[PDB]
């Protein structure tokens, strides 16, 4: 249960993950991380598991224009409207909460997420993010403002729920920020800020020191003074290319958003064409719509099961007889195929 933002935001000074496609092909610890995606939608209001307190600023609750961009180039509030999505198209994030961001996009295969106001020059960490449409209903459109249904399907929650599960990361800091050392020749000096520089002297058995200030290593300097990124205060859960194998099992457990409810979506119910139920036959001359799903069942009879996606109006073979046929074409009731007399 995570129904207050306060401590779960007050813990997380986050780090940038190893991203081999941010720009052209450049790869480094990008300050906004793209951990996973989450399918919580009947349609796909997708909730990507992201790198900071996603909106969770240093202000405890989120400032909506204070997007908690969290790198060693610090945990600060960039202009929170600068966060956007590239789904192969400008995505429609309804919200962003926790270490996730939840909203719709053009449902497809080309993942990208963007910080703008100091979240990059343009900060677009991407993937080949396969998140398919998979629409409820035989008609292949998304009926936004009026549709032929209002049918309940398992959508996620757009109010990011506080906690029913637990994003519990482990292995506190071990990552790529190690330039806080500096060179002398026979005695190296120390002065650092911006990381947790754990030192290591080469001519010296005391050089292992976590840095917050100046220091010195006589007898061996940088170039044998190995000072690297150590930290604590979370589990920035599973940063690949970097230490998610930090050898200290010490974790942080926060919530996750989006409890799934059956949202009633505007279904595909369009007007069907002229029923050419012949005097010894059946047919249904139908029109086109968004890419439809018609159904033939061997209704009453041996089950000739048929169906179809739709992109042009066609006359379907209605099994004409007194023994019935089973029709049901795109979000409406069926046709009991009976010839009269």
């Amino acid at each position: 249960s995570v129904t207050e933002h306060f401590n779960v935001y007050k813990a997380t000074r986050p780090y940038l993950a190893y991203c081999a496609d941010c720009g052209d092909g450049y790869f480094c610890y990008s300050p906004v991380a793209i951990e996973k995606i989450r399918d919580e939608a009947p349609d796909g209001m997708l909730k990507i598991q992201v790198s900071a307190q996603i909106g969770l600023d240093k202000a405890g609750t989120h400032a909506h224009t204070k997007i908690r961009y969290m790198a060693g180039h610090d945990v600060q509030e960039s202009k929170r409207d600068s966060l956007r999505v590239y789904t192969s198209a400008a995505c429609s994030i309804h919200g962003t909460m926790g270490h996730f961001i939840v909203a719709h996009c053009p449902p497809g295969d080309y993942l990208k997420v963007s910080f703008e106001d100091a979240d990059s020059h343009v900060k677009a960490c991407k993937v080949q993010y396969k998140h398919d449409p998979l629409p409820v209903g035989r008609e292949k459109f998304v009926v936004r403002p009026h549709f032929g249904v209002e049918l309940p399907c398992t959508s996620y929650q757009l109010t990011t729920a506080p906690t029913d599960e637990e994003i519990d990361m482990h292995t506190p800091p071990d990552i790529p920020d190690r330039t806080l050392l500096s060179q002398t020749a026979g005695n190296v000096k120390i002065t650092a800020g911006g990381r947790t520089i754990r030192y290591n002297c080469t001519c010296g058995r005391d050089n292992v020191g976590t840095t917050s200030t100046d220091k010195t290593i006589n007898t061996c300097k940088i170039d044998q003074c190995h000072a690297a990124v150590t930290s604590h205060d979370k589990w920035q859960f599973t940063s690949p290319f970097v230490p998610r194998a930090d050898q200290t099992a010490r974790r942080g457990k926060v919530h996750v958003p989006f409890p799934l409810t059956n949202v009633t979506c505007r279904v595909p119910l369009a007007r069907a064409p002229d029923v050419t139920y012949g005097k010894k036959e059946v047919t249904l001359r139908l029109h086109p719509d968004h890419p439809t799903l018609f159904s033939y069942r061997s209704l009453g009879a041996e089950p000739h099961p048929y169906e179809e996606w739709v992109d042009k109006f066609s006359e379907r073979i209605i099994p004409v007889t007194e023994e019935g046929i089973e029709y049901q074409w795109g979000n409406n009731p069926p046709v009991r195929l009976w010839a009269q007399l």
Binding site: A20, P240, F241, V242, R244
Partner: protein, 49 residues
Amino acid sequence: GRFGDIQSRTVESKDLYANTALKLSRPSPGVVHVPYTPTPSGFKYWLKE
């Protein structure tokens, strides 16, 4: 990766079978990569079917 590759014993129960091809790789040159590769998702494959 078949329909039910995520094996689950009882729906309240914890243990189960599993046949997704969880094949990680010993990692890449400088980036000490999680070389992780599971099988393609049988929840998503069963949704495909």
